[PDB]
Amino acid sequence: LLNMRLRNISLKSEHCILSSLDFQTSKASEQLTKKFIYPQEHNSFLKLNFQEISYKLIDGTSQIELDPICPLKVPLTAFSYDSISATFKLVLLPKSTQPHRVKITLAYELELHPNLKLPVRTSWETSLVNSKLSNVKFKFINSNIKVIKGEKFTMRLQIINSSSSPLDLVVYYNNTINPITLENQYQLHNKYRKIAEGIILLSNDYKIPYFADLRFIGIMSGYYGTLSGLKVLDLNTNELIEVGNGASVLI
Amino acid sequence: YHVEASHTSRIIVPIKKIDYKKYNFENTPIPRIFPGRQFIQSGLNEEQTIEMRQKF
Amino acid sequence: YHVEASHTSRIIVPIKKIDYKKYNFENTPIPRIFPGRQFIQSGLNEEQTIEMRQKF
């Protein structure tokens, strides 16, 4: 074995988990072979890695990678092509057969037949927030990453619960500073002074009765990921329910 | 604007600040509508009197 | 128009009449969406059938 490699599959909750095996012909056989080649007056080898594709299942299909693969042949390089893989709905882990081939055109144009094709198990190795009191769940129908200027915009929230008491929630945005190491002492304040100053909710204390279009305008600009001021609350048995979801860039 | 039968509409009225070197906000506080009366002790701390004058 | 949250607003739509010597309103009555079926007796008086045809 010469080309040392690793299998990296990264898991995302946008129903995607990409795969990019990294390869690098490391020093272990290089320290011997590039001194035999140094005795034979060569220090720029070229193993023509040009043929490589993946396999998904028993239907061994070449999945279309997100990146390209031309004739890659140089000395001491290292490559990691990224391939889009569909994320499963559960722990159905598709074992995979990583196939590759490099035709080792050595010094004095000496080709050598070699390939790197083997199989393993391609495990990854690892919107909505639920309630605390009721069966209520909160999601935003409009997409949680959205573009706007400093002007007005429409924002829309899902309320789905059990219809045993299907009512009496209230919103309020609570535009005041949470009053709160010295650089962290002026970091938590500058977090809170742009939470409570950025957007303003133009219909607060909105009685809900499912669907409601909540009404904001934002003043100053930035990335308001998990815009966390707004609090709905159940008027019986008052618990501070929070919706820490959604985002808004203002450029 | 328009408000139908329950629909609140938050009016966003822009103003300026005030300048503390232009008005004195420590003047005779809570002036009575009619002069005179009993003239009883305030029964409050002077600092409290300051913040009551500003908040009025 | 405008209707706020309970306020009815009676729309006053003007039309013309119809002419009884222009349309025949005694044509096949209450036509079925799909042809065929059992073909059971109507079980109603012919005069009643007349006023049901007009009121449809």
Are the beta carbons of B10 and A205 separated by less than 8 Å?
no
Answer for the pair A196, A174: CB distance below 8 angstroms, yes or no: yes
* Chain A residues whose beta carbon lies within 8 Å of the beta carbon of residue B3: none
Q: Which residues pair with A129 in a beta bridge?
A: A138
Neighbors of chain A by Cβ distance (3+ pairs < 8 Å)? B
Q: Taking phi first (over 0 means left), then psi (-120 to 50 degrees means alpha), and beta for anything else, what does residue A228 get?
A: alpha
| Smallest CA–CA distance from B4 into chain C, residue | C4
Q: How is residue A244 written in tokens?
A: 């820490």
Shortest alpha-carbon distance between residue B12 and chain C (Å) = 23
Length in residues, chain A? 251
| Smallest CA–CA distance from B6 into chain C, residue | C5
Taking the mean position of all CA atoms in its chain, how far away is CA A57?
24
| Smallest CA–CA distance from B9 into chain A, residue | A203
Q: How many CB atoms lie within 10 A of CB A106?
A: 15
* Chain A residues whose beta carbon lies within 8 Å of the beta carbon of residue B6: 207
Who's near A25: CB < 8 A, 6+ residues apart?
A2, A3, A4, A47, A76, A77, A78
Closest by CA position to B28, among listed B9, B53, B47: B53
Of the residues B2, B6, B7, B10, the best mutation for testing chain A's interface (the one with the most A CB atoms within 10 Å of its CB) is: B10
- The single-letter code of the amino acid at A17 is I
Shortest alpha-carbon distance between residue B8 and chain C (Å) = 13
Strand A212-218 vs strand A199-201: parallel, antiparallel, or unpaired?
Answer: antiparallel
Strand A169-172 vs strand A3-6: parallel, antiparallel, or unpaired?
Answer: unpaired
Q: In whole angstroms, what is the distance from residue B18 CA to residue C33 CA?
A: 77
Answer for the pair A147, A136: CB distance below 8 angstroms, yes or no: no
Q: How many CB atoms lie within 10 A of CB A227?
A: 21
Sheet holding A46-52, edge to edge: A46-52, A96-105, A115-120
Q: How is residue C52 written in tokens?
A: 């049901």
Are the beta carbons of B10 and A204 separated by less than 8 Å?
yes
Strand A96-105 vs strand A46-52: parallel, antiparallel, or unpaired?
Answer: antiparallel
Q: Taking phi first (over 0 means left), then psi (-120 to 50 degrees means alpha), and beta for anything else, what does residue A161 get?
A: beta
Do C and A have ≥3 inter-chain CB pairs under 8 A?
no
Q: In whole angstroms, what is the distance from residue A217 CA to residue A238 CA?
A: 28
Number of H helices, E strands in chain C: 1, 0
Answer for the pair A138, A128: CB distance below 8 angstroms, yes or no: yes
Shortest alpha-carbon distance between residue A202 and chain B (Å) = 6
Q: Taking phi first (over 0 means left), then psi (-120 to 50 degrees means alpha), and beta for anything else, what does residue A246 get?
A: left
Q: In whole angstroms, what is the distance from residue A74 CA to residue A43 CA?
A: 11
Resolution of the PDB structure in angstroms: 4.3
Burial grade of A96 (CB within 10 A; 0-12, 13-18, 19 or more): buried
| Smallest CA–CA distance from C5 into chain B, residue | B5
